[PDB]
Amino acid sequence: PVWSEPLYSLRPEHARERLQDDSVETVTSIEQAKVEEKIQEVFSSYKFNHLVPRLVLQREKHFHYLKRGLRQLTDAYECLDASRPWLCYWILHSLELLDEPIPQIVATDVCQFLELCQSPDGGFGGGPGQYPHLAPTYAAVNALCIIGTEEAYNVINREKLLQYLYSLKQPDGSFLMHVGGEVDVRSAYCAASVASLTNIITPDLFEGTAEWIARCQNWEGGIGGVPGMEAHGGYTFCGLAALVILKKERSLNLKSLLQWVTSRQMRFEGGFQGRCNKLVDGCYSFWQAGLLPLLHRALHAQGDPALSMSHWMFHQQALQEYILMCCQCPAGGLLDKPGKSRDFYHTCYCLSGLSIAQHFGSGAMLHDVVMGVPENVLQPTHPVYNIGPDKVIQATTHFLQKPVPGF
Amino acid sequence: FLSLDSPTYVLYRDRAEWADIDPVPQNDGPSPVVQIIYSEKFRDVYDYFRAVLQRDERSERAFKLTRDAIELNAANYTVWHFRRVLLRSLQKDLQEEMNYIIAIIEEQPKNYQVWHHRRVLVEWLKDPSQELEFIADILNQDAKNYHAWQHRQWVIQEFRLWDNELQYVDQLLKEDVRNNSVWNQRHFVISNTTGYSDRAVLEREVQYTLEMIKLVPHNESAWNYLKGILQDRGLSRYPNLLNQLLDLQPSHSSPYLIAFLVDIYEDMLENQCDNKEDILNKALELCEILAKEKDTIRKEYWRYIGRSLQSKHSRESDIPASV
């Protein structure tokens, strides 16, 4: 009809989704109300301005921001001086999602830079001369795979990488993040991601890892950083994704996991929160929503007959509305929520989450939902690795040609 | 000595006592990518850090240099590693180092390195006496700090400091009954002490939770806890639960209450309850109300639940095709 609002967040009934604090005010409700009031303003802006809403992904602005950042950054990034391979990954992936080609001048310089970050003993550090750490190692491998050239693949010293992973492995199945470092579920994922992509998984490398990850699932249904800790989207993504790689998703109670992640989508804002009773944040558009494709693939493998054949188990439309309307910086780049400043991390994860929300794929079955202008459509992302499905296939195929170190 | 923010702070390249060392610039290559345009102070400290690290100089001056490198970027795990090497080689007083890490954590509480460093100190000293109070102070500024709660669980578990934690949990729940981190801690304490099998304990817990639900019907955490502590034994194992939830339907409804009812029906159907059909319909009816009216953000999940319950609990479900 004519009175019909096609944007879910602008429908009159949507106002019913506002927080009900039961007249019991606590820090949690107060903070939540503040965000909802700010988000409501964004939603009502077109109406107060008397303009018809048009959801446009500011591609050219995002491209300029990324293109320059891949080369040079301000001192605002001093706090990420130990995360340079992440800056490479976040930027290259955002460009890949936006379907912007990677010039070979750029590709070769990234390769050479990541080589400088590679440790003589395996793994990659946060910058040249820094000790190897599993997080920048995961980021470096992903970045080299996004490039996907023989030169890129050849940068990875597979023998030393495997040695590095073994030096971090613990008797309980977990891994340290780096020598003398902390332990949490991120390490299991970083290790499984790089080891699977490079084909260096020996028969015992991940002995007990699936069990350790399974111990992280708590009473909430989600997964915490270490056994006993509160369920958290980033760690849950790390746990499930790692288990999917190890082909042990079944160690988890997938039912409670699914109920927990779906409950993390915010009824009013449309985006996802990282933990129950916390605020919405654009990066969780990936960590949380990315779980749905994983759960769909797992449940389906168990012959689940009730699974939809066209949608993920989350409000794809509402997530897209949240990102497009509330997470774009006018000058380029994406963010956490209105009032927050842009950064490459949020640019990478908001776009990743947007791609997940736009594309449903389950074998022969394929169904897209592109909110706003059709030019808004991004390139698909692999739900386990968060790099193009084609890069994943290409990389794995290439490394399967080499033999697992030692044989 | 000379703080990084001191008005009279001087760059290392202008310090006489460092004249013998040649700073080592960062090896970014011929044509850098993601090159950070560091400020003068940052690059200067790090060029000197690269020098001491490269020659593995385990000196008092190197020790003080790491404090500056850390203040410039507390996330530099390589600097923290070298600092720990120096703490051991130079036999530095660890309680003095504890005073230092408590100040740094107060400044940058959402950083991985600082909490890991504090853990290492506690382990080295085998002394958890300042932990609970230190953590309580951080939690007093951010009651949901993940690193703080994680460190707290480790201290409590490793040193067996369970005695007063439930009292602490109750205090924080008073301050903010919506704090999911506290509900998680409550579960943490009880699981590792009495456990939830003790019927007197489980009952106390459910009573408490229903009481909190009545006070704040829309607080999702209480609902998740209630479900979390009963779901393992099976929701149908508690016949009075259903009746009682239905009694809140009028004056205390929420999509949470409705969702829970579906959880109970679902388990009842899983454990061959009486009136298989009457229950199933009540369930599909609630799923529809949720997907179309009371909880549309989760319409895909609710439609899936309704479809699953249908798929295996309808009177036709066990009936062969030919019939």
Binding site: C79, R186, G234, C283, Y345, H346 | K110, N111, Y112
Partner: peptide
């Protein structure tokens, strides 16, 4: 800002 490492 959000810190992941």
């Amino acid at each position: 800002k959000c810190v992941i490492m």
